[PDB]
């Protein structure tokens, strides 16, 4: 197991840029930026395959949320089956995040609860929109994270923490 998904890429990020970025973690087997079949438009993500699993782990541990062409990358172990992303089991939503909190800070704090598959502070032109997500490997980790962190002050601003809800599910419950 030595394949990383590298997402949230700027459309103009190339394979070469990714090699330059990831190469210091150790020798690379191959790198593929995924593209639309005919127009070749980047799909906003890539696979980076290391020769050594320890090297892939180092890169994930060390280079996550680093900026390439002005946008922080989001690295995961490759998991092409989207069923867990779809089910949201273990996935949590955080709101009223002070704008001083970035991806790395959110990751460092929440990883105390358990191993994180993926997390993200959402950003636009003005920076953090003040909300984000953290998807834990286990649902027990998510539950502890919610129980502990909901209603807490994070850098002086009170957060909501709760199970992630998809747009359809949320518009259902709000009516």
């Amino acid at each position: 197991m030595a394949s990383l998904y590298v997402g949230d890429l700027h459309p103009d990020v190339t394979e070469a840029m990714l090699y330059e970025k990831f190469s210091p973690a150790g020798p690379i087997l191959s790198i593929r930026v995924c593209r639309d079949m005919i127009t070749r438009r980047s799909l906003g993500y890539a696979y980076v395959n290391f020769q050594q699993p320890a090297d892939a782990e180092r890169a994930l541990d060390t280079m996550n949320f680093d900026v390439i062409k002005g946008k922080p990358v989001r690295i995961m172990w490759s998991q092409r089956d989207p069923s867990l992303r779809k089910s949201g089991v273990g996935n949590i939503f955080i709101k009223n995040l002070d704008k001083s909190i970035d991806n790395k800070a959110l990751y460092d704090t929440f990883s105390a609860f358990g191993n994180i598959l993926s997390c993200k502070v959402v950003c636009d032109e003005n920076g953090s929109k003040g909300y984000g997500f953290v998807h834990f490997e286990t649902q027990e980790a998510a539950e502890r994270a919610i129980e502990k962190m909901n209603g807490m002050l994070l850098n002086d601003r009170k957060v909501f923490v709760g199970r992630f809800k998809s747009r359809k599910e949320r518009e259902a419950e709000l009516g």
């Binding site: 909190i101 800070a105 959110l106 460092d108 704090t109 105390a112 502990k148 962190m149 209603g151 807490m152 002050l153 994070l154 850098n155 002086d156 009170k158």
Partner: peptide
């Protein structure tokens, strides 16, 4: 980095407790 304070403990910083 992120500082965690608890409103139901008068806003006491509990950042170290949470991490362990």
């Amino acid at each position: 980095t992120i500082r965690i304070r608890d409103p139901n403990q008068g806003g006491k910083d509990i950042t170290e407790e949470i991490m362990s």
